[PDB]
């Protein structure tokens, strides 16, 4: 129907849950006559302050179009998930279906802000493997 | 409002360095030295020789507080210093100058002043 730009972040120690869930979420969206207009994972970062303990988190920009009843239920699920810690959703008017240039800011994350471990393989399993899937 | 300057008297750490925490208000200063592992090697305050009224928060009562606490942590065998600052209150500068004049380094003057979100109601029984 209309586009509601979900961006969300992931706890390190829990990261192994997300590669399975996102693909199930893409199947919930497209199974409701919406589209995924992006799904870019940004990598692992240092947070500006702790959120639910630990100083680092992992970033995913999902960018939904979907019927309005369902997008309210995915954002609530993602903020209350057992691996995603927080999410923020912004409005359809005077805004994009695909966001601003974060293209550099993604690489910077992968290059230098990364731990290089299993938890950061999962980030790449969660955005740079698909943009839409049926589960 | 001063800790033990004399030797063997209380438990020592002798780690060459510490961090100080300064709580600056318009009515007091609390200057408290701690270990880099996070344990108090001494404190003082600005009513440590009896300043009261406005005079309790001013640069000169802020300075003597800093001079009482800085003295003691030389028997806990510290030589170097770092500072955390918390409030736009007075003597916030006179206190830094006092730590450095006490024979310590003060290169990192880290503002970490907390933010209340104004969850309380302040005392009023009047027109203003």
């Amino acid at each position: 129907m209309r586009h509601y730009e979900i961006v969300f972040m992931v706890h390190p120690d829990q990261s192994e849950q997300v590669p399975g869930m996102i693909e199930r979420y893409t199947a919930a969206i497209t199974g409701a006559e919406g589209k995924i207009h992006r799904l870019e994972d940004w990598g692992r970062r240092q947070l500006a302050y702790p959120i639910n303990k630990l100083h680092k988190a992992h970033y995913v920009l999902m960018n939904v179009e979907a019927p309005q009843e369902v997008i309210d239920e995915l954002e609530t699920t993602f903020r209350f998930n057992d691996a995603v810690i927080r999410s923020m959703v912004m409005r359809t008017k005077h805004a994009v279906t695909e966001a601003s240039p974060m293209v550099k800011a993604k690489d910077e994350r992968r290059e230098r802000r990364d731990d290089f471990a299993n938890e950061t393989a999962d980030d790449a399993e969660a955005g740079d493997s698909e943009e839409e899937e049926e589960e | 409002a001063k800790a033990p300057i004399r030797a063997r008297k209380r438990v020592r750490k002798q780690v060459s360095d510490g961090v100080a925490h300064i709580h600056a208000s318009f009515n007091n200063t609390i200057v408290t030295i701690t270990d880099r592992q996070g344990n108090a090697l001494g404190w003082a305050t600005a009513g440590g020789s009896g300043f009261r009224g406005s005079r309790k928060s001013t640069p000169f009562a802020a300075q003597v507080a800093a001079e009482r606490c800085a003295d003691a942590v030389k028997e806990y065998g510290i030589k170097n210093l770092e500072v955390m600052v918390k409030g736009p209150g007075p003597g916030r500068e006179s206190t830094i100058r006092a730590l450095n004049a006490a024979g310590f380094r003060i290169t990192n003057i880290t503002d970490v002043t907390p933010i209340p979100h104004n969850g309380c109601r302040p005392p009023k029984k009047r027109r203003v």
Binding site: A48, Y49, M88, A95, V96, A105 | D111, V112, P114
Partner: protein, 74 residues
């Protein structure tokens, strides 16, 4: 000279782009002090459009800890 819009540094004390989206971090800092925190619009004469939309867009980012929230995170 016609349809050379944003060819150059024009408007602002410092030229970031967008004000409502917050997904990039490196073009919002243009309007953020060192304490980790929003520029005070009275003192600066901020460009009002960009400032009004940055008031929601910085909070959304803050709550997603993309930026500091409070001075103790300096």
């Amino acid at each position: 000279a016609r349809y050379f819009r944003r060819r150059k540094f024009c408007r602002f004390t410092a030229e970031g782009v967008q004000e409502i989206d917050y997904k990039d971090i490196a073009t919002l800092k243009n309007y953020i002090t060192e304490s980790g925190k929003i520029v005070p619009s009275r003192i600066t004469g901020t460009r009002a459009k960009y400032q009004r939309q940055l008031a929601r867009a910085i909070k959304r980012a803050r709550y997603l800890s993309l930026l500091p929230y409070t001075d103790r995170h300096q």
